[PDB]
């Protein structure tokens, strides 16, 4: 009479970077705490590690510039060899008319022959409740924001090879 229901809504976006997979990956994953505020000086005030050594299970916190609060990232998968990174957000993620259980952010960087890379981004929204309503603008906002972080880092690193 009463099923358990869950939706998983996946959005995929790609773009081609002229920066190498290795460099972009290091920028975001290893050196993020320094690079995020430098790349996004008007959006990210601070990026810090609250728990863990940087591997799976690590908890990071981004604090945003202005009255936009802060958010924790819970690191799931860290694969330097394959330039792959996954983390989850658990809090402050509800819409007005759709609660969410979590949002998962995944990127994979794939080298191209030109020695740039394809940046493969994914966002996955996991729904809470017995039904589902998610708008195009929302679903787009999330993957654009995420891909926009990566793009900002790429631009900073091209501009500043030593940081």
Ligand X SMILES: C/C(=C\CNc1ncnc2[nH]cnc12)CO
> How many whole angstroms separate alpha carbon 63 and alpha carbon 47?
6
Instruction: State which of residues 93, 104, 109, 153 lies at the interface with a second copy (CB under 8 A).
Output: 93
Q: Using alpha carbons only, what angle is made at residue 163 by residues 43 and 79, rounded to the nearest 5 degrees?
A: 80
Backbone dihedral angles phi then psi of residue 40, each to the nearest 5 degrees? -125, 60
In the complex with a second copy, which residue's Cβ is closer, 25 or 156?
156
Known binding residues for trans-zeatin are 73, 87, 138
- For the record, the structure tokens of 25 come out as 């990956």
Q: How does DSSP classify residue 140? A: H
Residue 73 binding result from ligand X, a second copy, Na ion, none, given CB thresholds of 5 to 8 Å by partner type = ligand X
Residue 46 binding result from Na ion, ligand X, a second copy, none, given CB thresholds of 5 to 8 Å by partner type = a second copy
* CB-CB contact of 88 with 105 (8 Å): yes
Interaction residues for a second copy, span 127-146 (CB under 8 A): 137-138, 140-142, 144-145
Residue ranges binding ligand X (CB under 6 A): 62, 65-67, 71, 73, 89, 103, 105, 141-142, 145-146, 149
Q: Give residue 54's region: left, alpha or beta (phi > 0; psi -120 to 50).
A: left
Residue 105 binding result from a second copy, Na ion, ligand X, none, given CB thresholds of 5 to 8 Å by partner type = ligand X
Query: Does residue 65 interact with a second copy by CB under 8 A?
Result: yes
């Amino acid at each position: 009479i009463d099923p358990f229901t869950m939706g998983v809504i996946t959005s995929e976006s790609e773009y081609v970077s002229s920066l190498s997979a290795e460099k972009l990956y290091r920028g975001i994953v290893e050196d993020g705490n320094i690079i995020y505020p430098k790349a996004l000086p008007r959006f990210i005030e601070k990026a810090e590690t609250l728990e863990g050594d940087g591997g799976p299970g690590t908890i990071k916190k981004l604090t945003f510039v202005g009255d936009f609060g802060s958010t924790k990232q819970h690191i799931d998968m860290v694969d330097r060899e394959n330039c792959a990174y996954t983390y989850s957000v658990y809090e402050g993620i509800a819409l007005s008319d759709q609660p969410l259980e979590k949002i998962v952010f995944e990127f994979k960087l794939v080298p191209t022959p030109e020695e740039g890379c394809i940046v493969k981004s994914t966002t996955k929204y996991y729904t809470k409740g017995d039904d589902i309503e998610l708008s195009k603008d929302y679903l787009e906002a999330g993957i654009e924001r995420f891909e926009g972080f990566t793009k900002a880092v790429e631009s900073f690193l091209l501009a500043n090879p030593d940081y």
